[PDB]
């Protein structure tokens, strides 16, 4: 769950769909703060936007940018 | 796990991406306090930012500086 999330989130950053700031904020939040239920949301989004990294990035931002800041 | 983490953390210090203080604080925290789950986060970050030591350093600081101080 963690391994996979980190890899994808780096991939998005490297591909330019998320900025460095959000990646850093997000990984911190996911690693420590994010609750069991909140991890299930993230896992679920990742699986839904497989071939659509742009839509995934936009979704993670829309859902979690407030919580991670 | 420990051996590898220590080597990387020293490498970052010696390369100037982390200061001496944080290295010392971090090794203490990792050696003694850090929980099973917290070690998995560290291991995972290290593996993600191999070729980007600046980003690794910035990530470890963002995630762990509070816990190690």
Author numbering:
A (entry chain A), B (entry chain B): 621 to 689
Sentences from the paper on this structure:
The Arabidopsis VEL proteins are accessory proteins that interact with PRC2 to nucleate and propagate silencing at the FLOWERING LOCUS C (FLC) locus, enabling early flowering in spring. Here, we report that VEL proteins contain a domain related to an atypical four-helix bundle that engages in spontaneous concentration-dependent head-to-tail polymerization to assemble dynamic biomolecular condensates. The VEL domain adopts a compact globular fold, consisting of four α-helices in a quasi-antiparallel “up-down-up-down” configuration, each of which contributes to the hydrophobic core, as illustrated by VEL1VEL. Mutations blocking polymerization of this VEL domain prevent Polycomb silencing at FLC.
Noting that most crystal structures of SAM and DIX domains were determined with polymerization-defective mutants, we switched to this approach and thus succeeded in obtaining diffracting crystals of different mutants (including I664D, I575D, and RR>AD) under diverse conditions. We conclude that the VEL head and tail surfaces are defined largely by three key residues, an isoleucine (VIN3I575 or VEL1I664) and two basic residues (VIN3R554,R556 or VEL1R643,K645), that engage in close hydrophobic or electrostatic interactions, respectively, with partner residues from the apposing complementary surface. Indeed, VEL1VEL I664D crystals contain right-handed helical filaments composed of 12 protomers per turn that interact through their head and tail surfaces. Three of these filaments intertwine into a superhelical fiber whose width (∼79 Å) is similar to that of the WT VEL1VEL fibers observed by EM, suggesting correspondence between the superhelical fibers observed by these two methods. The same is true for VEL1 filaments, whereas the VIN3 filaments in the crystals are composed of dimeric VIN3VEL subunits. Clearly, VIN3VEL, but not VEL1VEL, has an intrinsic propensity to undergo domain swapping while forming assemblies during crystallization.
